Amino acid sequence: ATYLIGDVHGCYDELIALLHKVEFTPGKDTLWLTGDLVARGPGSLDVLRYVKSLGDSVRLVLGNHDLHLLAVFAGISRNKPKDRLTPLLEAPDADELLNWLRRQPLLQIDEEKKLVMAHAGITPQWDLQTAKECARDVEAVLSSDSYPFFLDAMYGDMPNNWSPELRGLGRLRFITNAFTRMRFCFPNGQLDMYSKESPEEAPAPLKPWFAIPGPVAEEYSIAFGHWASLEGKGTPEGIYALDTGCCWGGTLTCLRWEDKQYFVQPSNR
Ligand SMILES: Nc1ncnc2c1ncn2[C@@H]1O[C@H](COP(=O)(O)OP(=O)(O)O)[C@@H](O)[C@H]1O
Ligand SMILES: [Mn+2]
Ligand SMILES: [Mn+2]
């Protein structure tokens, strides 16, 4: 079977309990994770150890907190105490775990299932070919020896409008924001980088990225995490918002793809 789980945010106990609930069996089953594996929850170290050990039985996309962790590890950004990253950063296998983490994709595609995954979703300004190329470019810099220069460059809220003519720093920043920070769009599809609330309480003319028709969503189901204020509701057919806020005292959600059956694990704190 195929299982898709939203943002774990260091909630290792809840992850393991949910996976035992569905009897997840590496070799017979595959697990999809929406990213933001780490931070806020107490168990980022255990989460990373486990997900890395799954190997080919897991398909991960990186989220904004995974990228932030990489930036802290490389000394680009400052550690926020609330993230609870110190046990992972000080772990004897920190190098192993994080060098593995920076090699993981921003985008997963399964053609037989017609299924696409990224942390924040797919901007309506991208077709599948363009999303693929952008994911490849950013993954290539993330997996290179020079990845801390990229991590430093990534921070920023501009430009927020895609164009194939974008070059250099602006292009990489947009790609990063579209995959890992996107929530609301302007009607022309341009990113808004500020509002993090639920769609009903957002100001006009902002609309959810998935409320705007785009070539990828027209042909593929899209699964994503990231947008916890959504609470996994209010999406159209073929759009699966899996982040139900486990680190926030909400719930960890698992979707079995074959029968679209949901399994839910309450937060422990
Ligand atoms: N149910 C909710 N309603 C409104 N805001 C929320 C809700 N849940 C989380 N948030 C807020 O959303 C902000 C962004 O957090 P989140 O959606 O989890 O994304 P990320 O993990 O990338 O930081 C947090 O500052 C939190 O306070
Ligand atoms: Mn996120
Ligand atoms: Mn998150």
Side-chain angles (χ1 to χ4, degrees), residues 122-135 137-173:
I122 307 281
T123 168
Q125 305 187 303
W126 281 350
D127 57 8
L128 190 80
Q129 187 50 255
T130 297
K132 283 194 246 183
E133 284 161 9
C134 292
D137 296 337
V138 173
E139 296 161 10
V141 49
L142 278 177
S143 62
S144 74
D145 297 339
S146 322
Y147 76 89
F149 301 110
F150 157 62
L151 287 178
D152 201 26
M154 90 201 175
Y155 284 105
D157 298 353
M158 280 317 270
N160 56 22
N161 199 67
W162 170 255
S163 154
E165 327 306 350
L166 286 177
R167 290 280 179 291
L169 288 174
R171 180 178 182 107
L172 282 208
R173 290 202 258 276

Side-chain angles (χ1 to χ4, degrees), residues 61-77 79-97:
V61 288
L62 300 170
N64 49 310
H65 287 266
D66 312 310
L67 295 184
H68 173 70
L69 159 70
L70 295 166
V72 176
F73 176 68
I76 303 284
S77 308
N79 196 24
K80 294 166 198 133
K82 54 112 191 153
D83 284 339
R84 314 220 156 248
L85 300 179
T86 290
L88 170 51
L89 292 170
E90 295 185 343
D93 45 345
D95 286 357
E96 167 197 340
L97 299 170

Side-chain angles (χ1 to χ4, degrees), residues 3-27 29-77 79-135 137-199 201-217 219-236 238-267:
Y3 295 101
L4 305 87
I5 294 183
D7 304 27
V8 180
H9 276 298
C11 299
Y12 172 81
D13 286 338
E14 291 95 332
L15 175 62
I16 298 308
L18 187 50
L19 287 169
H20 288 168
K21 209 171 264 218
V22 302
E23 286 181 21
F24 170 68
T25 304
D29 307 318
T30 300
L31 167 64
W32 292 46
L33 285 168
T34 58
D36 278 6
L37 299 176
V38 305
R40 304 189 179 113
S44 297
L45 171 57
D46 290 329
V47 172
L48 271 207
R49 292 179 161 159
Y50 174 60
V51 175
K52 178 171 187 286
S53 79
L54 289 171
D56 286 354
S57 283
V58 72
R59 298 178 68 162
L60 178 75
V61 288
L62 300 170
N64 49 310
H65 287 266
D66 312 310
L67 295 184
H68 173 70
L69 159 70
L70 295 166
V72 176
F73 176 68
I76 303 284
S77 308
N79 196 24
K80 294 166 198 133
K82 54 112 191 153
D83 284 339
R84 314 220 156 248
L85 300 179
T86 290
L88 170 51
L89 292 170
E90 295 185 343
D93 45 345
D95 286 357
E96 167 197 340
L97 299 170
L98 296 158
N99 281 320
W100 168 88
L101 177 67
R102 76 195 173 78
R103 293 179 333 242
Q104 298 313 299
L106 279 160
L107 176 71
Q108 297 276 356
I109 304 161
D110 187 325
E111 286 291 344
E112 297 62 59
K113 310 188 203 352
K114 293 310 270 177
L115 169 67
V116 166
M117 179 170 75
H119 178 62
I122 307 281
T123 168
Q125 305 187 303
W126 281 350
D127 57 8
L128 190 80
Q129 187 50 255
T130 297
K132 283 194 246 183
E133 284 161 9
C134 292
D137 296 337
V138 173
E139 296 161 10
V141 49
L142 278 177
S143 62
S144 74
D145 297 339
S146 322
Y147 76 89
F149 301 110
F150 157 62
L151 287 178
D152 201 26
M154 90 201 175
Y155 284 105
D157 298 353
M158 280 317 270
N160 56 22
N161 199 67
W162 170 255
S163 154
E165 327 306 350
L166 286 177
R167 290 280 179 291
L169 288 174
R171 180 178 182 107
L172 282 208
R173 290 202 258 276
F174 175 90
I175 290 172
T176 300
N177 289 342
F179 278 131
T180 69
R181 296 176 66 201
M182 180 183 58
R183 287 177 179 85
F184 290 99
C185 289
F186 290 86
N188 74 354
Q190 144 185 340
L191 299 178
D192 175 273
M193 290 315 288
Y194 300 117
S195 149
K196 299 213 216 135
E197 53 262 20
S198 76
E201 97 197 301
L206 290 184
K207 286 292 206 213
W209 65 264
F210 51 73
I212 300 180
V216 175
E219 191 191 342
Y220 289 79
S221 301
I222 301 168
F224 70 107
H226 182 59
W227 191 349
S229 66
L230 201 56
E231 316 204 280
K233 26 182 145 153
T235 59
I239 298 292
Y240 300 91
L242 297 174
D243 185 359
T244 49
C246 186
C247 71
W248 298 115
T251 61
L252 189 61
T253 295
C254 171
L255 173 67
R256 181 163 63 209
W257 190 252
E258 286 73 39
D259 49 354
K260 306 296 193 280
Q261 185 169 341
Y262 288 88
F263 308 84
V264 166
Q265 185 69 34
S267 167

